[PDB]
Amino acid sequence: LPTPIENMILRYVKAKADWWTNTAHYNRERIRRGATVDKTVCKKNLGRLTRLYLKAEQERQHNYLKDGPYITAEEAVAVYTTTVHWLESRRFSPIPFPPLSYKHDTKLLILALERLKEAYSVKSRLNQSQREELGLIEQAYDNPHEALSRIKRHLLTQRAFKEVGIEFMDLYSHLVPVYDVEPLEKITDAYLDQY
Amino acid sequence: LGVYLTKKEQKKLRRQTRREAQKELQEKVRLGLMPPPEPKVRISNLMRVLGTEAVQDPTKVEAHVRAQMAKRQKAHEEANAARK
Amino acid sequence: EYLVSPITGEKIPASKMQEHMRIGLLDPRWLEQRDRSIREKQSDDEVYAPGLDIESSLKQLAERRTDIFGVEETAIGKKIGPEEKVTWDGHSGSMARTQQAAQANIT
Amino acid sequence: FLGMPAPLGYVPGLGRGATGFTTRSDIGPARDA
Amino acid sequence: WDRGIPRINTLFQKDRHTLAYDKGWRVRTDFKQYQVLKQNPFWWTHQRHDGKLWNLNNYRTDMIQALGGVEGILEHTLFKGTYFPTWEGLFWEKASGFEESMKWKKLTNAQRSGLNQIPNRRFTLWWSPTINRANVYVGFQVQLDL
Amino acid sequence: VDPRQTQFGRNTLMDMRLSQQTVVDPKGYLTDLNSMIPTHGGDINDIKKARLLLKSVRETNPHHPPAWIASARLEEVTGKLQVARNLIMKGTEMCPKSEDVWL
Amino acid sequence: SYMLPHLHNGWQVDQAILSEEDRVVVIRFGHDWDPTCMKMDEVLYSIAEKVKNFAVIYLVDITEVPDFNKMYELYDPCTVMFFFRNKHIMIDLGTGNNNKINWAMEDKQEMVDIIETVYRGARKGRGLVVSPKDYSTKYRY
Amino acid sequence: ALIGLMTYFREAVVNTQELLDLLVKCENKIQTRIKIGLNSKMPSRFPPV
Amino acid sequence: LRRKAARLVAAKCTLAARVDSFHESTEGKVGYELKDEIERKFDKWQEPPPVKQVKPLPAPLDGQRKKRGGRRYRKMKERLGLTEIRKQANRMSFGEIEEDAYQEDLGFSLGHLGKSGSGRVRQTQVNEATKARISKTLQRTLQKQS
Amino acid sequence: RSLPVEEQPKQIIVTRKGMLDPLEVHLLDFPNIVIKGSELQLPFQACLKVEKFGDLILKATEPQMVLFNLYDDWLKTISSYTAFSRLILILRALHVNNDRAKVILKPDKTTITEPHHIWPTLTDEEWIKVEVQLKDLILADYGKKNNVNVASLTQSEIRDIILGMEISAPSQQRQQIA
Amino acid sequence: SERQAEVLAEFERRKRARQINVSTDDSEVKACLRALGEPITLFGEGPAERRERLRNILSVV
RNA sequence: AAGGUAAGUAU
RNA sequence: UUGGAACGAUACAGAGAAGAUUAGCAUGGCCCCUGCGCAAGGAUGACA
Secondary structure (H helix, E strand, C coil): CCHHHHHHHHHHHHHHHHHHHHHHHHHHHHHHHCCCCCHHHHHHHHHHHHHHHHHHHHHHHHHHHHHCCCCCHHHHHHHHHHHHHHHHHHCCCCCCCCCCCCCCHHHHHHHHHHHHHHCCCCCCCCCHHHHHHHHHHHHHHHCHHHHHHHHHHHHHHCCCCCCCEEEEEECCCCEEEEEECCHHHHHHHHHHHHC | CCCCCCHHHHHHHHHHHHHHHHHHHHHHHHCCCCCCCCCCCCCCCHHHHCCCCCCCCHHHHHHHHHHHHHHHHHHHHHHHHHHC | CEEECCCCCCEEEHHHHHHHHHHCCCCHHHHHHHHHHHHHHHHCCCCCCCHHHHHHHHHHHHCCCCCCCCCCCCCCCCCCCCCCCCCCCCCHHHHHHHHHHHHHCCC | CCCCCCCCCCCCCCCCCCCCCCCCCCCCCCCCC | CCCCCCCHHHHHCCCCCCHHHCCCHHHHHHHHHHCCCCCCCCCCCCHHHHCCCCCCHHHHHHHHHHCCHHHHHHCCCCHHHHCCCCCCCCEEECCCCCCCHHHHCCCCHHHHHHHCCHHHHHHHHHCHHHHCCCCCCCCCCCCCCC | CCCCCCCCCCCCCCCEECCCCCCCCCCCEECCCCCCCCCCCCCECCHHHHHHHHHHHHHHCCCCHHHHHHHHHHHHHHCCHHHHHHHHHHHHHHCCCCHHHHC | CCCCCEECCHHHHHHHHHHCCCCEEEEEEECCCCHHHHHHHHHHHHCCCCCCCCEEEEEEECCCCHHHHHHHCCCCCEEEEEECCCCEEEEECCCCCCCCECCCCCCHHHHHHHHHHHHHHHHCCCCEEECCCCCCCCCCC | CHHHHHHHHCCHHHHCHHHHHHHHHHHHHHHHHHHHHHCCCCCCCCCCC | CHHHHHHHHHHHHHHHHHHHCCCCCCCCHHHHHHHHHHHHHHHHHCCCCCCCCCCCCCCCCCCCCCCCCCHHHHHHHHHHCCCHHHHHHCEEECCCCCCCCCCCCCCCCCCCCCCCCCCCCECCCCCHHHCCCCCHHHHHHHHCCC | CCCCCCCCCCEEEECCHHHCHHHHHHCCCCCCCEEEECCCCCCHHHHHHCCCCHHHHHCCCCCCCCCCCCCCCHHHCCCHHHHHHHHHHHHHHHHHCCCHHHHHHCCCCCCCCCCCCCCCCCCHHHHHHHHHHHHHHHHHHHHHHCCCCCCCCCHHHHHHHHHCCCCCCCCHHHHHHC | CHHHHHHHHHHHHHHHHCCCCCCCCHHHHHHHHHHHCCCCCCCCCCHHHHHHHHHHHHHHC
16 A cells, blocks of 8 residues: 555544544433434444443553553552451361362252353244353253363363453443353353352 | 375265266266166155055055165175176 | 376376376366356446546535535535426326427427 | 437436326426426 | 242242252342343342242232223224134134244345234234224224225 | 251052963953052143043042042142142042052 | 446436346435435445345436436435336335335345345335335334 | 332332333333334324223 | 464474584575575465455345255254144133243243143153254364363 | 053054043153044954954953954064054955955965964965955945045045045035135 | 257267366377367366367367 | 325226 | 326226245265275194
């Protein structure tokens, strides 16, 4: 791309981005106040706010990575010492790793799988991802011990995970982030939460 | 010296030869050279292909189906014996 | 060097062996697929306007929207800064008079 | 075709079998006899 | 039976042993809003753990009583046009035998959108003697051609 | 309910047939002393229709202890534990020699 | 607006309607500079390629081509009209005017649905098609 | 939504006189939506049955 | 794009080191012959994506298209066809008001399932042909995990 | 309850609609068994017309439970599908006439029924001929009592005649629908 | 009928074409086409189209 | 004042 | 005989529903199993 053409395209992008940000914020304030708006307008505005919020989040994460942790060592030491003293006062035994012969290793797995199937309790048409998750849950229920072994293996050795999708529930007064995690990791996370 | 085509290459060659033979048969049937293929009927298949005629003359249908099964077996054994 | 073909039963030069195996089993339905992909491509029409039409339309739009283009600013639709064509009203009773008026307008 | 002058003495309504429509009487010029 | 905050119903629940190992369920239900894309009106409670803290039996009973009962309600409907001898041995079919088969047949967005309005075409038919009235829709009337 | 629970956490058969150059194979008729099928909670779809049919069984064969057992246990799974007692009492009045009904 | 093909006289509109035999001709009567027309034309440009198989979109300047103003009542700021095999197709939009779409539609999916419904009905031989969406209300809440 | 709100608060509704107006307005909006779905022209004496 | 670059650079550096350990190509002809192809690979990886034509939506479809039937079609129909329990699900008794079942969704209802009037004395069983199981490619991942 | 789980049925077909609810009540411990009604009347009531069943059960002084093998030795030469098809055909023929059918069942004076089983022992082609004769017999009464030609019967409706499905239509005025 | 004869002739021509060995070298294909007289390229045909044309020519010839 | 036009062949 | 209207009138029809519907076999994919061919290769039994 020639430099003058690129420069004018950049000027156009800057002007359109300024208008885009202003329009998104103005429409969001209209909706928050109670202005009567259409469904397509709401969807477009939600998309614009999602893009703006994610850009701001990228800026914030880059700032944290570049500027390091924002908690000074003295503050972290004070917090940790207070927590240690509290735990010592209450005589708290740390939660151990779930044993292979755990007395409740199956009840917790059933409880975890039930919560994952509660999203589908209301009858609805299933797409590929939903039916894949249900197949994984059914496979875990059919062979509880293999699922438990996979869960313990993930707890011990898994430190890297696949990307999770993000959407935003539009409450018309603010945006509530919603996270879509892989079902295979969802089973492990649910069992860990229950345990 | 000779050369050895790889496993993927063998799969491609076999698939192409099978498709060539299948197209040969299909165009023979299109132009009426060979009679159109009849459905392949086994015992478990008898009630799906010959279901409506196996209530009127059940044993004739059974005999016809078993004759077809034997003829399919007859050609296989004949090819094996001629090749041996 | 010379090598026997495992696909053709013929002797070929050693330097062409790789390409010989690569294109000796080119599936003919690939050629069929390419043919039908090019036959549809040739018959495809132009959805959008050509460059000349795009440029002329942009200039015509600029000649009217003087709140974006130009120096002086007139109204939204004004171009600033005899004969009236006879058109049919869509009625079967006025086909003849409209047609004759169109004929009568030829110089 | 595109970029082709209209033939002289041609009525755009005629030659196509077009028929108009009126949603009301308040829109469009008055019908001329 | 339906009195306490942890409804006495829950003591007789079939899965009352697996729920005893369910801890932190209210916090989890509250935090479910960050995983599902639909807001839960009952975010504060669980039917299995806390019981059903409300009953609409009396409400529906008094709603049928206030509308004049079955006889009063069904005079507004095409029920008397069906010539059913009585309302006892009757059942609806929520989805048609064919309408339900089309829920999964690769329909376009426009084709599917118009197929989601089929139940309404029945609803309007059910309440036609009352919706299609001169008292409720003032104006001229047009009769069907046949 | 379980003894520890706190605020915060059927149609049996009396006929048996043992199965082992003759067209006729009269197999012996055996009677089981007692038959206690599991409660089978929730296996009934139409409670009212099943209740009517079990009433019909009691009427046609008043001397069929499985009929009374299934009829009353249907009231026990339904939760109406008081009518089940009456059904068993009537069954005892009509099937006194069956120890299953008394148990 | 400036990307879609333009028809410059009444004869060209006649030929465009006559030429297509298996696709619905979608014609936007209006002006390039009209804001309503710019929104309608940008939606049409957005869906121009997707409906290539069963629709062709043209733009007609009513000031330059006032040939159909009297018969088609092309007096609204924007107008979208559908033709099939040289036959104007009406749409039961619920707006009271079945002969045309005389407003700018925001969503690009609704226009695709309208074109698809028009194509189905016209290929079935109908002269009126009921739109999948009732436009008697803008559904603003 | 209505049963969730009413069974969550159950006492705070009566004192919040603005909530009563909000609830009846929302109910009227829903009924108007249904009526517009039935027919574009709004009815004059639509029944509650 | 850095792990792939690291692998490629490591392989080419190994080749260059094997060349150098025998003191061959002292000037660096092999070194440049490898560096320029490293740059070529880097350029190829960072190449702008090519032009890909937009696929238009298929034209609306009218008429009849012959579809085959057989074991695959039978299996697909069994998986997608109406089941007896799912047949009872969409049947609602007329006039018999039922208590709300699911708290979070009042629209949800079992219908004739488990309710009197369905005409079935015994409980309907689950059609095992409608079982949910993972895809073929999801089975492959489980083989690469255990 | 007597048979083992491997030989336990999982699909019970009932030839009378009256015995659908009683089975559902008496199979309340076996939910995994589907009970299907039959709209077509199978000729299973005509097996007592056989010489080896009627007199056998008339003089039975006490109730009892007996086992028979309706497939005498067919299973050694044909599958159970053809065995059941020919059994249905034979029972339909017996239900039809029981007079000419008994004559058809033995094609030659040299064909006898051994006391072990019920039907006579025949060659495979002999059974083919007996089956075609019995099919003609079954079509004969449909031709007579309905005054229709047998040739007018398509191959699709001969199957319905053999099985036992028949349709009637007193209300032809519903021709108004078209 | 001669129609059956010509259809059978075309079918056997194609069957023979399916079993004729043709070199995959473009230079040798061009040399063979030059030897047999037919043009190297016809209406912008590709190398695969050239190979098909040579196969057809060798089948007829 | 409206958002309430069946469409289609035939003269 | 000669004009109004012709976006009308009348005549016919009016299911203005909803759709590329559905049964069989073969191919193709996968894992065996069986038989024969082809190219090689193992281990082992046998005296005068």
